[PDB]
Design a protein around this nucleic acid. Structure first.
Lengths: 132, 147, 187, 149
RNA sequence: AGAGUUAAACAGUACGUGAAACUGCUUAGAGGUUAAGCCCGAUGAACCUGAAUAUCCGUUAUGGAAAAUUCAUCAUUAAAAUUGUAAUAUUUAAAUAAUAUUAUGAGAAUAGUGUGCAUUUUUUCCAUAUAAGGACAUUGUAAUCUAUUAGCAUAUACCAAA
RNA sequence: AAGUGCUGAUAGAUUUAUAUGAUUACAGUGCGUUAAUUUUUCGGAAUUAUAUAAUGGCAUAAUUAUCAUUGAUUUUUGUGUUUAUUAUAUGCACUUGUAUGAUUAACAAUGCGAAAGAUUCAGGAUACCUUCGGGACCCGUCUUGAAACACGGACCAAGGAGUCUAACAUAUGUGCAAGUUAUUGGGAUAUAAACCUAAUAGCGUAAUUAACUUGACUAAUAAUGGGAUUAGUUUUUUAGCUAU
RNA sequence: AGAUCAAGGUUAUGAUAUAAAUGUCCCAGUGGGCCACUUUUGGUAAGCAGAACUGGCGCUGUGGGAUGAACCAAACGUAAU
RNA sequence: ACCUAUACAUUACCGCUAAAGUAGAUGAUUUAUAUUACUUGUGAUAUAAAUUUUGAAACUUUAGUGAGUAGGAAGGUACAAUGGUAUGCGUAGAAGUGUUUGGCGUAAGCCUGCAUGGAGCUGCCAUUGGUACAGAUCUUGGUGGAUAGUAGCAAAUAAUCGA
């Protein structure tokens, strides 16, 4: 529908599956997210052979497909119609995500104006659902 | 901790700062010895500083081209490369290539000895060139007799 | 892989100061323009002197200027000091001169305007002589500060000579056992 | 009172020792609480770095008053910020209307020392003391001192 | 249990928000294995994600309409400005720099009228012609390039060995 | 040792080079002398002299130098000579055209971003479950050593351990400068703010010896007083380059 | 021995410089170690102790003798060949 | 002849270290054309067209390079209140709570959809406090398996039909 942005390549990432925090299997007081286990015995700290691939600066993406969402842009926070005037002339580059304290009164005012401003949103149809 | 509120003065007020911070030529009045402080950079333009007719008679280098061209190349798979980094590489080929090329004639003539078929238009003109090359040596008998 | 990424591969010295000014950056954002068109060594030493702290960008008192302006056969050279050429009294007569300087105190302008030679700043200088032809460069002392003689003690040598941390002067203050004769030993 | 991202221990959690060791770690005092024993086992880091200690240089000055050794010390090299600064300019015309009068007790300076190396002008100067290396050089310079009341 | 009362009872004396560990339930799978776990790359199942734009041998030739017009080869006039001069006034003795008003200068610049003012203009849609309406994604080629293996070799040249 | 001459493949192809700077120069193409030899005869084909430092072949002169020296290796060359050789003697426009800016790209197939609706191609453990191949001790920590037949851990939500001041040192920011400081104070005047401010008084200025004394370069001047290590500027003249 | 003139080649062994050169904080730690080859005391001796000269283990994964902190290959950015 | 390493080599890529380039845009720059000075042919003029922006803390470009506890500095994010700030969203659903909706980072962490819910909340930049927890034979409050039905309720003579 919308023209895809501004020299859209193959977004091809190094390691994709998430990174899950040594011994978070047998403690559900242990969360999901990582903490380099800094203590002198460990079985992953020594970057061993078998465990949950240990992060560093290697795995990142290219320094032009930084932040690049699967539709070419780089995502960007939007609040009201005045910040969509920030996306006046850059409309072929970035996109918008309607901030989730905006009600369905004001989100009527983005989706009918910035459509004609030719920007892309990730989420229209939030509370649309054609009721109040 | 930020500059600039929108400030509105009055005339009796506005003629007290000259008392309250004197001038560039004097100390002030209402405080003892509080001089008007200094700048550390006394012209603070940059665009009209680069105008300039006193700076850009001494500048040297607008290296506008970048000169990057950073690609390596192979010295055998690119036969194109050879002559460029090294002339006389054409010499050693175009010496030995014809020596092989006459030797390609030198073994089909054994087949033209065994069967004697052609020699019609594929190698007949390839061996009749010596009759033309005889004339390249009749000038050695008629045009090289000048010294 | 190999083995050397050894040490130091790390060029320590300062790229830009830990200072968030908008005047001092304006010299940097000017004098980066005037050392990367010319290659003149005189501009780079201006640039590498725009970077030290409050101490070690040395204070520099006016009598040190004068006999350097009496380093004679130079009646036209402009004075460049990256520092603070303040005023000292006991230079009674003051000569005509024109200085480029960072910071000039209010009692220092008042005698050189009484000289009367105009002092100029750096952008004020920058209009005139970017080449540095007939330009002088004066940098003050750095054993100057009295807090910088605490180095480097191992007292047995008579090359000791190095100011211990006193409490305060008088008697019964770091003066019995070790220093003088009779209380154990002379240093 | 700190900007604490700078302060060393708000990135140290979590390392799992926080900054003071993992063998013989931070035990409430190892040292001897204070200065013990400057003669006893902290010997080496008290000579060197602090000789002259422990003992008795001797004169038991019973109840010093810090007035009898007041003597605030001015030097002859200044001497003309003492007078007006432009007032020196009219003394180099030449006009021998001077030696001028330089009180010191009214200034707040007492004994004229002799670092000095004054100009050639005569000066009549009044101090609360003398210094021999100065006063002979003043006496070549056409001026002389007289002791203040 | 119904019937209610209230915006709410998915607020009914732990009477707001109700998690976390336990798990009672139904659907979904599965199974004598490293004891459970994971980690590596696939894996059906299942929902999902990202998908598009004015040419080969052109941002070409050519024909249809519509609206109009400071644009023509358009004239004037109304401006305000900008740039660049000239002058005056604030200057640290003068110049300069700098603002403030004063005028000239050129060209542009809009609002308004005007050969033809829609005559061969201008601005929006419609047309054929050369590879041609796609111009994009995943694919099979074909060759090119730096690395890189496997498989044949055209003629040499060297001692001795005869 | 020489492209000797390919024939078959593998996976991989940076580059928004203005989204703040040759798309240029090497080469290849079709247009404007020539003469015949030769071949095909449809093109092609083949010819020298035009100029070189020539660079080897050979010859001699000549020397530097040499294990050796009948000599041979040579060196500097010098000349003659034929014989080989190569590059220089291609402007003028044009061309999808060679090569050059980490030198990958023509073709073909597969498909309509189809009012809403919605098929197609790749990907996608998001966090399961299903199916197999290798991996694999289960977490703190003292210690040379913990998978420990070493101690602490049943599970979870909330709470918890680098702080306060004290004076110092150093690094560093910010003003100022032989000065600096109100922050004990009053008064101006709206409130715990700030403003303004006077004498002091801290600390430096000028040192000490146990103290009394004395008091910091011969001079109207000197700077670790002289020395060498020196950037930089000035200058002597030199050639020199670009502008000239 | 010092200052100051006079003459002076191309600076005088190889191979490099991943850059050399220094003053503070005396800056956090750490002041218990282990092993193999040779060299080696103590003891009959030991996976014991006691060392000098290296390399390594603690700090270190790793491919290989199934296994094993040191053995022998090699010292660990993410990826295809 | 083959065999396998995170080693060696080459292409991409990430961060880090080193080196190097870029600011007269009231310009620069080609593309054409009118002209011209004409110097054969190189230049200036005029017209027409189009390319030309960044926290110079930027940007381009180049090479090399990457283990790590004890420990030191480097920028990065949570949870706070205080003054500045965004004509900041908020009963037309604000804070946390779940999640088989979707996504960005190397990573901590956000952004987003739906479902509760009922009255307040965050982003840039200055500051800053009792600031992020798996641990302390840690404190307190729920709650497991064993068992949520096992352990065992066995001393003192012994209870019984019918209403």
């Amino acid at each position: 529908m919308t023209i895809r942005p501004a020299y859209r390549p193959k977004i091809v990432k190094k390691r994709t599956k998430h990174f899950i925090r040594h011994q978070s299997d047998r403690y559900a007081k242990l969360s999901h997210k990582w903490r380099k286990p800094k203590g002198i015995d460990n079985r992953v700290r020594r970057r061993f052979k078998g465990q949950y691939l240990m992060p560093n600066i290697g795995y990142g993406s290219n320094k032009r497909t930084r932040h690049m969402l699967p539709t070419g842009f780089k995502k960007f926070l939007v609040h009201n119609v005045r910040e969509l005037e920030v996306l006046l002339m850059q409309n072929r580059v970035y996109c918008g995500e309607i901030a989730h304290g905006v009600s369905s009164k004001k989100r009527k005012e983005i989706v009918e104006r910035a459509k004609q401003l030719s920007v892309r949103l990730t989420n229209p149809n939030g509370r649309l659902r054609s009721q109040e | 901790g930020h500059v600039g509120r929108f400030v509105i003065w009055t005339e009796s007020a506005f003629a007290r700062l000259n008392d309250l911070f004197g001038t560039w030529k004097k100390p002030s009045t209402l405080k003892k010895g509080y001089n008007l402080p200094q700048p550390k950079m006394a012209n603070t333009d940059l665009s009209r500083l680069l105008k300039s007719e006193e700076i850009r008679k001494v500048l040297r280098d607008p290296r506008k081209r970048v000169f990057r061209s950073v690609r390596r190349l192979n010295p055998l798979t690119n036969v194109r490369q050879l002559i460029k980094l090294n002339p006389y590489a054409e010499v050693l080929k175009r010496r030995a290539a014809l020596a092989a090329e006459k030797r390609t004639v030198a073994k089909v003539l054994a087949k033209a000895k065994k069967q004697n078929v052609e020699l019609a238009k594929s190698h007949f003109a390839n061996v009749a060139t010596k009759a033309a090359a005889n004339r390249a040596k009749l000038l050695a008998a008629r045009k090289k007799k000048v010294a | 892989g190999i083995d050397i990424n050894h040490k130091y591969d790390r060029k320590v010295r300062r790229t830009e100061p830990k200072s968030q000014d908008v005047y001092l950056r304006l010299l940097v954002k000017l004098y980066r323009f005037l050392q990367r068109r010319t290659n003149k060594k005189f501009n780079r030493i201006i640039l590498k002197r725009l970077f030290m702290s409050k101490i070690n960008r040395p204070p520099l008192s006016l009598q040190r200027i004068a006999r350097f302006f009496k380093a004679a056969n130079q009646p036209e050279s402009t004075i460049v000091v990256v520092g603070t050429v303040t005023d000292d009294a006991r230079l009674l007569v003051v000569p005509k001169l024109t200085v480029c300087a960072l910071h000039v105190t209010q009692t220092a302008r008042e005698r050189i305007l009484k000289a009367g030679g105009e002092v100029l700043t750096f952008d004020q200088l920058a209009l005139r002589s970017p080449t540095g032809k007939n330009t002088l460069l004066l940098q003050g002392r750095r054993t100057a500060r009295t807090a910088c003689k605490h180095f480097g003690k191992a007292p047995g040598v008579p090359h000791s000579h190095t100011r211990p941390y006193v409490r305060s002067k008088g008697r019964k203050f770091e003066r019995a056992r070790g220093r003088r004769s009779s209380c154990g030993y002379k240093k | 009172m700190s900007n604490i991202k700078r302060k060393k221990t708000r990135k140290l959690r979590g390392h799992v020792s926080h900054g003071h060791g993992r063998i013989g770690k931070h035990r409430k005092h190892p040292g001897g609480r204070g200065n013990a024993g400057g003669m006893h086992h902290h010997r080496i880091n008290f000579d060197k770095y602090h000789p002259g200690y422990f003992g008795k240089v001797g004169m038991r000055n019973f109840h010093l008053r810090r007035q009898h050794k007041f003597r605030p010390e001015i030097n002859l090299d200044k001497l003309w910020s003492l007078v007006g600064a432009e007032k020196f300019a009219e003394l180099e015309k030449e006009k021998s209307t001077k030696a001028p009068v330089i009180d010191l007790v009214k200034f707040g300076y007492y004994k004229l020392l002799g670092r000095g190396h004054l100009p050639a002008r005569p000066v009549i100067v009044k101090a609360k003391y003398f210094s021999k290396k100065a006063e002979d050089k003043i006496k070549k310079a056409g001026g002389v001192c007289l002791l203040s009341a």
